[PDB]
Design an enzyme around this catalytic site. Sequence first.
Site, short mmCIF file in Angstrom:
data_model
loop_
_atom_site.label_atom_id
_atom_site.label_comp_id
_atom_site.label_asym_id
_atom_site.label_seq_id
_atom_site.Cartn_x
_atom_site.Cartn_y
_atom_site.Cartn_z
N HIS A 64 3.10 19.30 -48.72
CA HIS A 64 2.19 20.17 -49.45
C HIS A 64 1.39 21.07 -48.51
O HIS A 64 0.88 20.60 -47.50
CB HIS A 64 1.23 19.34 -50.31
CG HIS A 64 0.35 20.16 -51.20
ND1 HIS A 64 0.82 20.89 -52.27
CD2 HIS A 64 -0.99 20.38 -51.16
CE1 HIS A 64 -0.18 21.53 -52.84
NE2 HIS A 64 -1.29 21.23 -52.19
C1 LIG Z 1 -8.75 22.10 -43.32
C2 LIG Z 1 -7.85 21.05 -43.93
C3 LIG Z 1 -6.50 21.33 -44.17
C4 LIG Z 1 -5.66 20.38 -44.74
N1 LIG Z 1 -4.36 20.68 -44.96
C5 LIG Z 1 -3.51 19.77 -45.51
C6 LIG Z 1 -2.08 20.04 -45.77
O1 LIG Z 1 -1.57 21.15 -45.49
N2 LIG Z 1 -1.32 19.09 -46.32
C7 LIG Z 1 -1.82 17.88 -46.64
O2 LIG Z 1 -1.07 17.03 -47.15
N3 LIG Z 1 -3.12 17.55 -46.43
C8 LIG Z 1 -4.00 18.42 -45.88
N4 LIG Z 1 -5.34 18.08 -45.67
C9 LIG Z 1 -5.79 16.74 -46.04
C10 LIG Z 1 -5.95 16.61 -47.55
O3 LIG Z 1 -6.82 17.64 -48.05
C11 LIG Z 1 -6.51 15.23 -47.85
O4 LIG Z 1 -5.64 14.26 -47.28
C12 LIG Z 1 -6.65 14.99 -49.34
O5 LIG Z 1 -7.68 15.82 -49.87
C13 LIG Z 1 -6.99 13.53 -49.60
O6 LIG Z 1 -7.31 13.37 -50.98
P1 LIG Z 1 -8.46 12.33 -51.41
O7 LIG Z 1 -8.41 12.22 -52.92
O8 LIG Z 1 -8.33 11.11 -50.53
O9 LIG Z 1 -9.82 13.07 -50.96
P2 LIG Z 1 -10.29 14.53 -51.47
O10 LIG Z 1 -9.19 15.22 -52.25
O11 LIG Z 1 -10.94 15.21 -50.29
O12 LIG Z 1 -11.42 14.17 -52.56
C14 LIG Z 1 -12.75 13.84 -52.19
C15 LIG Z 1 -13.70 14.43 -53.22
O13 LIG Z 1 -14.73 13.49 -53.52
C16 LIG Z 1 -15.99 14.14 -53.56
N5 LIG Z 1 -17.04 13.18 -53.13
C17 LIG Z 1 -17.27 12.74 -51.88
N6 LIG Z 1 -18.30 11.85 -51.87
C18 LIG Z 1 -18.73 11.71 -53.13
C19 LIG Z 1 -19.77 10.92 -53.83
N7 LIG Z 1 -20.59 10.09 -53.15
N8 LIG Z 1 -19.88 11.07 -55.17
C20 LIG Z 1 -19.08 11.90 -55.87
N9 LIG Z 1 -18.11 12.64 -55.30
C21 LIG Z 1 -17.89 12.58 -53.96
C22 LIG Z 1 -15.87 15.39 -52.71
O14 LIG Z 1 -16.65 16.47 -53.24
C23 LIG Z 1 -14.38 15.71 -52.74
O15 LIG Z 1 -14.09 16.77 -53.66
C24 LIG Z 1 -6.21 19.04 -45.10
C25 LIG Z 1 -7.56 18.76 -44.86
C26 LIG Z 1 -8.39 19.72 -44.30
C27 LIG Z 1 -9.84 19.40 -44.04
#
Ligand SMILES: Cc1cc2nc3c(=O)[nH]c(=O)nc-3n(C[C@H](O)[C@H](O)[C@H](O)COP(=O)(O)OP(=O)(O)OC[C@H]3O[C@@H](n4cnc5c(N)ncnc54)[C@H](O)[C@@H]3O)c2cc1C
Lengths: 485, 485
Positions: free
Chosen positions: B459
């Site tokens: 992705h």
């Molecule tokens: C610059 C950058 C580029 C990236 N590019 C890629 C890529 O090309 N391909 C790829 O596979 N991955 C990529 N990633 C990694 C990917 O975005 C993450 O692995 C993914 O978002 C993980 O999903 P998640 O549900 O674990 O966390 P996230 O999708 O980050 O969800 C966390 C959410 O929880 C919320 N939150 C946090 N704390 C609290 C709280 N206390 N209460 C309520 N809400 C809260 C935040 O607002 C956030 O929206 C990238 C990351 C970054 C920083």
Amino acid sequence: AFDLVVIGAGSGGLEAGWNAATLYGKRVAVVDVQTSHGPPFYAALGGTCVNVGCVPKKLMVTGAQYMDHLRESAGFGWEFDGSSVKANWKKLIAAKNEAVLDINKSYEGMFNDTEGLDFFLGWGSLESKNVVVVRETADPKSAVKERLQADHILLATGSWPQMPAIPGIEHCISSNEAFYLPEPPRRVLTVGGGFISVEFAGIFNAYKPPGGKVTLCYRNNLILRGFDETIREEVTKQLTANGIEIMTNENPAKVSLNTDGSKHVTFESGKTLDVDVVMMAIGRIPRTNDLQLGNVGVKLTPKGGVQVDEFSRTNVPNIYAIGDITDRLMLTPVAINEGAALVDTVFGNKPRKTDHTRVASAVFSIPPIGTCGLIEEVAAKEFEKVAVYMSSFTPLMHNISGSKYKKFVAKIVTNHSDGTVLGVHLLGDGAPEIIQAVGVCLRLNAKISDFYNTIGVHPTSAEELCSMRTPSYYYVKGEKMEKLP
Amino acid sequence: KAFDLVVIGAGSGGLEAGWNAATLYGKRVAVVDVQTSHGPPFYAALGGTCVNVGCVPKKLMVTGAQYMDHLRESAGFGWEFDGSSVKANWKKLIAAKNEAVLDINKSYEGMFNDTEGLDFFLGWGSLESKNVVVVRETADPKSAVKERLQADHILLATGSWPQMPAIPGIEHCISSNEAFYLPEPPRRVLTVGGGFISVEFAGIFNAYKPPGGKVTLCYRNNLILRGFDETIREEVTKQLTANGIEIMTNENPAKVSLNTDGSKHVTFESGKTLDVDVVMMAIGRIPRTNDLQLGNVGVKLTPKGGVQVDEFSRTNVPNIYAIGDITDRLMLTPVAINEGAALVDTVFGNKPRKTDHTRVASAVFSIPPIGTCGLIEEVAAKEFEKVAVYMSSFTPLMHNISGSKYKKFVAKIVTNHSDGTVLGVHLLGDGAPEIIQAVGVCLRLNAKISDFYNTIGVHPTSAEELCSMRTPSYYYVKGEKMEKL
Ligand SMILES: Cc1cc2nc3c(=O)[nH]c(=O)nc-3n(C[C@H](O)[C@H](O)[C@H](O)COP(=O)(O)OP(=O)(O)OC[C@H]3O[C@@H](n4cnc5c(N)ncnc54)[C@H](O)[C@@H]3O)c2cc1C
Ligand SMILES: Cc1cc2nc3c(=O)[nH]c(=O)nc-3n(C[C@H](O)[C@H](O)[C@H](O)COP(=O)(O)OP(=O)(O)OC[C@H]3O[C@@H](n4cnc5c(N)ncnc54)[C@H](O)[C@@H]3O)c2cc1C
Ligand SMILES: c1cc2cc(-c3ncc(C4(N5CCCC5)CCCCC4)s3)ccc2[nH]1
Ligand SMILES: c1cc2cc(-c3ncc(C4(N5CCCC5)CCCCC4)s3)ccc2[nH]1
Ligand SMILES: c1cc2cc(-c3ncc(C4(N5CCCC5)CCCCC4)s3)ccc2[nH]1
């Protein structure tokens, strides 16, 4: 009530929550700290990927590639007024902002017409092992506005940029702020060797104003640790050839402001550098400190990530954790895979767990990387005899383009005993798209002969993966030499 | 002069055979061709049709043509320049293509010079007797003999030639061969044919035409690109029309006359008329059997006109073989290459090998391009009782921002629903040819739809969409289409 409450409406959280309300008619709450992308919390409804990660970054890389396309078009006969060319950062960001905000709204719409699926603005914390506090800010002593009774709690708060403890760190930004700079920086320093630093180095390199200079620094010898080594050295060279200064074995010791607002960076080595932006991308850490995990004794790994088993369960029976908070493979598709897998186990007796081995990933550097499975030096340590197939050609078109440095690199790693493919590592335009179906091959326990007995599609760079029959060298017992004795 | 193998035609299939026999099994090899480098008077040359007037030069030229889009599309991502200063120089494209092809020509010479047991002979090969290849100065049997090569084995590999219809004024038309060398880009051009060559060139001419220009593609039947997936056929029709190419289905030229200024007045069978500067016939390619004197030894042809061969490329005359376009099966470079390799393994090595002609990945370099492998819906519905069809189609985000909203991506997976094995994959959009390569490896491993959607996506990419299609969009049961079971 609530069968499931999700803290963090990101890649993993949104999948788990949708696969529950729609698939199993369960009651689901989802908590996130914003409805739309941007300051002051940057990440928002949709996740890091949607708001300040994969999606907008891809658009910005795609934007940055046009610097090359414009330059390279001349070799194919294209002319235009060169010194009328302007890279408009502000138009790009505006176009990115509207793209993200469109996705923000579509999820907003998703919630407002799906029963058993409601969204709550604010900061989720852990009060007791069956309740989640929705506060107004990250301060534990800020106004409460919901208290969600929960049968099952999912922790999906993702990760957050790491910042080293140096003087002047306040003057440094992270990737989050990079997405919202009002102007493209003339001089920029990205700190770290990881994929985020490399990708943004290319973005800034493309959009910087006249007199500009991107510098990338890394505290150790060779950038992009954890990736194939030949690819690491090549990307280094090719970034250099496109004007990026790569500055290894250096690390910032402090940062003061100059009288113009620019940053005066002093490195540990005593060397100095004045830039307009300092972007720290030295690592991503799991976002745990606002959750009050101590209130329920939720356990962490030695590195500050939430400990979980192969089914995403904590020590606390009905509390779970997925995605970047678990401090494993920080990838949107994995977090999505873990979320969907978590649900149908619990809410449908379909016990699926996610495979973390042989996952295809990309890096949208210029040039980009695609990779799946193990690198060679790692494979050497859990296999007796490893074979490495390597091909490094300068693609067809770059003889004409004027970008001679754009070498494509294709590498296959096998357990040489039975020729099973352990790794595949690609460098060059197309790699991210090529590797996806390679993931499927590795999942089918594909052997090297399945690749070279497959008929090529010509002309492609992908072709090369079917044109390597004889190893370039081997690893036996962990030792590197050319011929098998 | 006495040899183990004599190869007539130093092309894709021929060279691979000669090189393998000489370098792998130490045999004495002669290879015959009419030129050492590309272009008039004979166009194809040392290296083959693909190197000199095929896959290689056409790709470079398509790549050149893609810059029309890139330059327009860059504005969506904040790139600004004087659009009225933009123009394409056709002579520079041609000149650059000539250099690139020449270096391959130069490289193949020197391969011969440095590899012992592998010799090149300039001239026109022919069968005098079952063990003697005669080389003459011209294609005419009356021309002077240059060599008489004794041969234990003879490989016929002269490829194919552009079929030209027998209409009045055909002299005023050209084929792909001459299109590669036009001194000026045609302002108006008619490309005659619904096959890949016509389509690709239509895109090339579309990009490089001067002010007030117009590309028209005609085709005597209803829908272009027979043998390809119907949705893609219809989409690429729209996307070509969307970029300024007039499509002229159910039409076919009847004659061509010269105007006063030297332009061409085409009259179609329907009676419609059209003035153009160039008429390029790309209505088909036919096996090049004309000059080989096959009747002298009694080599048999297929009722279709190709050289008849069994599954090991053997003709009816023992120790005489044929591969590549002359056999009139799959006219593709890698297939000829595979056929040549399989032939040398069988005859000079000690293990029989034969080219699998099914599930062969292939491409069309339209803008955007097609990538495909395996069967299409209709063929699958004749072979199998239950057939599923997974489908996904949309204008990607990047192109909604670029301004090219017409560029609708298309992914399709055709499955035998009884066991779920993938029978065909078909793609339309950026990177499609690169994506489909590893898909060829999957299908060789008899992959099932479950193996794709259970594979974790990369992705953000277009390929990702192949691993995100879990339930059929529709079915084909007992030959009949239906939106359900
Ligand atoms: C610059 C950058 C580029 C990236 N590019 C890629 C890529 O090309 N391909 C790829 O596979 N991955 C990529 N990633 C990694 C990917 O975005 C993450 O692995 C993914 O978002 C993980 O999903 P998640 O549900 O674990 O966390 P996230 O999708 O980050 O969800 C966390 C959410 O929880 C919320 N939150 C946090 N704390 C609290 C709280 N206390 N209460 C309520 N809400 C809260 C935040 O607002 C956030 O929206 C990238 C990351 C970054 C920083
Ligand atoms: C415009 C165009 C685009 C194409 N694009 C693609 C593509 O993208 N991908 C793909 O897979 N395929 C493509 N093809 C098909 C590909 O070029 C052929 O399938 C391939 O070249 C066939 O190889 P071959 O070994 O059969 O003969 P060729 O490679 O055609 O070579 C035959 C050689 O024999 C020589 N010869 C002829 N007569 C004699 C004689 N009497 N004595 C000695 N030598 C002789 C010729 O000079 C020629 O060099 C394309 C073809 C064309 C025309
Ligand atoms: C009413 C329903 C509705 C559904 C959506 C969806 N967008 C993506 C959806 C999907 N997931 C991804 C993130 C959690 C949901 C689920 C269905 C299609 C695959 C993506 S559903 C978006 C807007 C909607 N309005
Ligand atoms: C000077 C140039 C030179 C070039 C070669 C080769 N180039 C490509 C070669 C290959 N083919 C092309 C057609 C049959 C041989 C053989 C190795 C696999 C990749 C292509 S061999 C081999 C020896 C050479 N000496
Ligand atoms: C090495 C030889 C060589 C030859 C040519 C051409 N030969 C004839 C050409 C043509 N000439 C006729 C006079 C004006 C154009 C005649 C063939 C059709 C295309 C143009 S182009 C073009 C490139 C070449 N490289």
